Nucleic acid binder design. Structure first.
Ligand SMILES: [Mg+2]
Ligand SMILES: [Mg+2]
Ligand SMILES: [Mg+2]
Ligand SMILES: [Mg+2]
Lengths: 114, 59, 148, 210
RNA sequence: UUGUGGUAGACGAGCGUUGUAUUGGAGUUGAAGUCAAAGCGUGAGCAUUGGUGGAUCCAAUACAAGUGAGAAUGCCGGCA
RNA sequence: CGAUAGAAGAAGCUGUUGGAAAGCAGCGCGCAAAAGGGUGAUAGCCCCGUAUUUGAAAUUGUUUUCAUACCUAGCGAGAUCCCUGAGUAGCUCGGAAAACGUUAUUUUGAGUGAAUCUGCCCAGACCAUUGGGUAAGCCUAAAUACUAAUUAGUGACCGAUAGCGAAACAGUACCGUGAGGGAAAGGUGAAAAGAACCCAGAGAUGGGAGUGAAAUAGAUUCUGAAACCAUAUGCCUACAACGUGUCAGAGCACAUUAAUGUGUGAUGGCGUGCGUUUUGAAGUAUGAGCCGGCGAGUUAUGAUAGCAAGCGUUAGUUAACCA
C-alpha cells in the first residue's frame, strides 16, 4: 500500500501562513519564512504579556507622582500615608484614574493628613 | 542465532542461571604463585553479575 | 459478538516510531545518541567484545570434555515424588505406553529414583533402582523386579 | 433451550426441540473470539505486492558526477532512493508471511462460545431435511421462504450435514445468504450470520465436538 | 496536600493519512479535490457558508502499513 | 475424456428533478444468471455476456480396452571341478571432496603393486574375535528446480515524480569513434454538432454569431494550488537607523462563521532568525535562492524481557505433509 498525502502538508502550511498576515515582503508568501516569523512573534507575545504589566504599573506610578507633586508631597511619602495611617488597600491605578476625575482625588490626598 | 563456539566450551550453565566457570592463572607458572593461591583457584566459581548480561545472550 | 464493534482487553502498546519528529520524542537522533560508532548504520560490534581488551571468554581456561565424541546415554526416569499421583499398579513399559508418559516407539531403558514415601503398593519392572528408593518401595509392602 | 423447527411455509412447527446443556456454556471467552476473527481475516491475503530496491532497478553503477571539484551533491548513483528514477528503499516484499496462530483448544473455546451466544438469539430456527427439498432448483421459492419468515434484510446462514444440492442450487445467486457443511463454518463465518438455520441432525455432531 | 523549566534519553496517552472488513448513511436538488471568510478545540487537528468543479464519499469499532517533511553543497519540474 | 473456431441462453413499465435517469419514488417480474463491460448520471429485467445445456469436417493430447511382438518364472540331488570385472584395491610423495584447516572413508598428478570363497573390503590410526557387504562394468520413470511462453483469473499491488527503463512508433530521440549510457510527456464532449457567417487585421488570432446542458468545455483542450508577474477599491509612507515583529495607541475606511468585531497602523516601550555541530554561535563557522512533489529504522528466520489470552499438575504443544 502506498500513501501520498499532499492534502495534510498543504493544510498545515496553510495554517502557518495564515497565522502571519500583515507581514512585510515575502514573510506572508513563503512558508519557511512564515514559520520563523510566527515562532518569533509568539516569543515576543510571551515576553510582552509580562513586560506590559511590568510597564503599566510604572506608568501609573509616574502619573501619580505628577499629581502629588502639585500638592506639596511626593509619591514616595504618599505610600506611607496609605499603609501605616488609615490602612487603605486602594489600588495603584485607581488612585491614578481619580485625577482624570479630580476634586474627588483631593479628598484622598488631604484625608491622609491626619 | 548460533551459539558462540568459543563460549559454550568455557561457561557451563547450571540450574537457575548462575553461569559456571573455571578460574584463570592455573595453566602456566606454578612457582610464581603460592600454595594458598593455587588451591583457592582450583575450585570453580560463578560469573560476576556485570558480565552475566554479556554472557547470557552469548549462549 | 458484533464484528461492527470488536474490542480486545489490552494488547496495543506504545510503538516507538524512531524517526518521525520530536513531539513524539525519539526524533532526529532517533535514540542512537550523538555521533558515535553506535550512531552510524550497523553499530553494535560483535556480541562478545570489549574492544581490544582480551574478552572474558578468551581470558578464561577451557572446560575439558572427557568422553570426547560421544553422547550421554539418556535414561527414561520414574521419580517417586510424582508417580504417586499417577494411578497405576504393575509399572512397566507395556502400561507406560498406555499412560502416555513413555512412547511405544521408544526402545529406551527405565530407571527408578526418589526418596518420597508412597502409600499403596506398586510393582515396578525397571532397569535400575536406587538404594533408598528400593527401600521406600519395599516398606510399602510392594516389590521391585530388576530387569536384566 | 426452546429451539423450534420451521416449515417451508414460514409458519413454525408446534413441537419445539430441547437441547443438551453441554452446548450452552455458562462461561464465555471474548478474547479468543477476537483472535479467531483476526486470524481468519488474515490468511485471506494473497500478499502478491512487490517493489524494486536500490539494486534491482535497471540502473547505472556509473558514478554520475566526480566526487569533488564539480560543485554539486555527492550523489553516488542514478538509481538511489532519493532520486526520481527510484530505488524504493524498504518497500513491500512478496515474502511476508501474514499468518497468525491460535492454539487448537483456544479455537475450540472460541467456537464453543460463539455458538453459545448465536444459538440462543431468537433467530436460530432449527430446520429439517424436508424443506431442503420441496424447494426446487428455482430460487423464487427460497425467496418466498425468506420473505414469509421475515428474514430478507438479514444475512441468513444455512448449516447442513449432508450437503443437499437442491438447496445450494438456490441461494447461490443470492449474494446475502450461503450454505455450509458443519465442518466449514468458522468463527467469523458464524458471528457474521445475524440469522441462521441449523438442521436438526448436526446437534448430535456438535455436542460431540464441544 | 505536594508539585507542573529542560537537550541527550526512559515511560504513558493520543491526532491524522491509505486501504480491507462488517454496521449506519449522504450524493447531478451537485461528491471528493481547490481557493476565500471576521469559527470551535489543551495540541496534533476539526467543522460551517459561498464561488469553482462535475462523480464519488463521510462518521463509529477493529485490522494492515510504501503512514506524517524546512534543512541531506538532496533528486525532478517550474519560477524569480 | 479433453485442447484448438462457436450455438441457444429468462425477466419492466409509469411519474419527478433533469441536457440525457439506468438514480429517487410507485406497482411488478425472473433466476442453476445479483461475475463483468458498455448504454448521455449509480441498471438483476436496454444490449453484450455469465450460470446452465450443448456441438468438430481437420489437426493434436491423456487414458482405457482387445490382439500383437522382444524380454522375463520354480523346488531338489552330486562335489578339492571352473568362473565371479588388474596397472585394479592398496603402500609411498605432493593436493583436494567430505561438516572436519587432511584424518578413518572418497577422489588423484608421480612411483611401486596383491589375493581369489579357508577369499576381498568395512564397523575414525591399528591387531585379534564377532558381525555386516561383495568393489574395480552399464541403464533407470516418479517425488524435485525453473517459467520469457498459451489460456482463464486473482490481488487489504502501482495508478503518469508511481508502476517494467518504456501507458505514445522506447531501448526511440539523444551522448559517445566504441563497448556502452539513456530520458520526458496521457484525459475536449456522451457525440465534432472541430466553432459556416460578420467586424478589425496582411495573417495567425481576437471579439459577436452558431451548435451544445456549460464555449471560465474551443482544440493552450478533466480538475487547475503555490512560488511567480501584472491591475484595482480601502489605509499608511518622501528627518529617517529598521532579524522588520510584538505590547500599547491615535486618526482613517468599512461592516462580520455577532463577536469586549474587521483592514491599514502616524507615535511610545521592547526586540542580534531556523536546522546542524559545539565548552559556547546573531555569528566574521557552516546548509538551504523560492514553491510543489519524491526521499531515510522495514522484512524473513531465531534469542531474552514486559503485558494480555488459552490450557494446566504425569502438564502444554505441533512442524513437514494430506483433504
Ligand atoms: Mg548528526
Ligand atoms: Mg572400529
Ligand atoms: Mg527538525
Ligand atoms: Mg564559506
Amino acid at each position: 500500500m502506498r500513501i501520498k498525502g499532499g492534502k495534510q502538508t498543504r493544510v498545515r502550511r496553510k495554517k502557518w501562513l495564515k497565522q502571519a498576515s500583515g507581514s512585510f515582503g515575502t514573510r506572508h508568501a513563503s512558508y519557511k519564512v512564515a514559520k520563523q516569523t510566527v515562532i518569533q512573534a509568539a516569543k515576543y507575545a510571551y515576553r510582552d504579556r509580562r513586560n506590559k504589566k511590568r510597564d503599566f504599573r510604572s506608568l501609573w506610578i509616574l502619573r501619580l507622582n505628577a499629581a502629588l507633586r502639585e500638592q506639596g508631597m511626593t509619591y514616595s511619602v504618599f505610600i506611607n500615608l496609605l499603609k501605616k495611617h488609615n490602612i487603605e488597600i486602594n489600588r495603584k491605578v485607581l488612585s491614578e484614574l481619580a485625577i482624570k476625575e479630580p476634586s474627588k482625588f483631593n479628598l484622598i490626598v488631604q484625608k491622609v493628613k491626619s | 542465532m548460533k551459539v558462540k563456539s568459543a563460549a559454550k566450551k568455557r561457561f557451563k550453565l547450571t540450574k537457575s542461571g548462575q553461569i559456571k566457570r573455571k578460574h584463570a592463572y592455573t595453566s602456566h607458572l606454578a612457582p610464581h604463585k603460592t600454595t594458598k593461591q593455587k588451591r583457592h583457584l582450583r575450585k570453580q566459581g560463578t560469573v560476576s553479575a556485570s558480565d552475566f548480561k554479556r554472557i547470557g545472550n552469548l549462549i | 459478538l458484533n464484528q461492527l464493534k470488536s474490542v480486545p482487553k489490552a494488547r496495543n502498546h506504545k510503538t516507538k516510531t524512531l524517526g518521525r519528529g520530536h513531539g513524539s520524542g525519539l526524533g532526529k537522533t532517533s535514540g542512537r545518541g550523538q555521533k558515535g560508532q553506535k550512531a552510524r548504520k550497523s553499530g553494535l560490534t560483535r556480541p562478545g567484545f570489549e574492544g581490544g581488551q582480551t574478552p572474558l571468554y578468551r581470558r578464561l581456561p577451557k572446560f575439558g570434555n572427557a568422553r570426547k565424541g560421544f553422547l550421554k546415554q539418556e535414561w527414561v526416569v520414574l521419580n517417586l515424588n510424582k508417580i504417586a499421583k499417577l494411578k497405576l499398579d504393575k509399572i512397566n513399559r507395556a502400561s507406560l505406553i498406555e499412560k502416555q508418559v513413555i512412547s511405544a516407539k521408544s526402545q529406551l531403558p527405565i530407571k527408578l529414583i526418589g526418596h518420597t514415601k508412597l502409600e499403596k503398593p506398586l510393582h515396578f519392572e525397571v532397569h535400575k533402582v536406587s538404594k533408598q528408593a528400593l527401600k521406600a518401595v519395599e516398606n510399602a509392602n510392594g516389590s521391585v523386579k530388576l530387569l536384566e | 433451550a426452546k429451539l423450534k423447527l420451521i416449515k417451508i411455509d414460514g409458519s413454525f412447527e408446534t413441537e419445539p426441540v430441547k437441547l443438551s446443556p453441554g452446548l450452552i456454556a455458562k462461561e464465555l471467552k471474548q478474547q479468543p473470539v477476537f483472535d479467531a476473527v483476526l486470524v481468519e481475516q488474515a490468511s485471506w491475503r494473497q500478499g502478491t505486492h512487490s517493489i524494486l530496491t536500490k539494486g534491482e532497478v535497471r540502473g547505472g553503477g556509473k558514478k554520475p558526477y566526480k566526487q569533488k571539484h564539480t560543485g554539486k551533491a555527492r550523489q553516488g548513483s542514478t538509481r538511489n532512493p532519493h532520486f526520481v528514477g527510484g530505488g524504493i528503499v524498504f518497500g513491500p516484499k512478496p515474502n511476508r508471511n501474514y499468518s497468525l496462530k491460535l492454539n487448537k483448544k483456544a479455537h475450540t473455546a472460541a467456537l464453543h462460545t460463539v455458538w453459545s451466544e448465536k444459538l440462543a438469539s431468537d433467530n436460530t430456527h432449527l430446520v429439517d431435511q424436508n424443506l431442503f427439498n420441496k424447494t426446487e432448483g428455482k430460487t423464487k421459492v427460497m425467496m418466498q421462504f425468506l420473505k414469509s419468515a421475515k428474514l430478507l434484510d438479514k444475512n441468513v446462514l444455512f448449516v447442513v450435514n449432508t450437503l443437499n444440492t437442491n438447496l445450494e442450487q438456490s441461494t447461490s445467486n443470492i449474494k446475502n445468504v450461503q450454505v455450509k457443511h458443519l465442518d466449514k463454518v468458522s468463527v467469523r463465518d458464524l458471528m457474521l450470520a445475524n440469522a441462521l438455520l441449523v438442521e436438526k441432525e448436526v446437534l448430535k455432531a456438535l455436542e460431540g465436538k464441544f
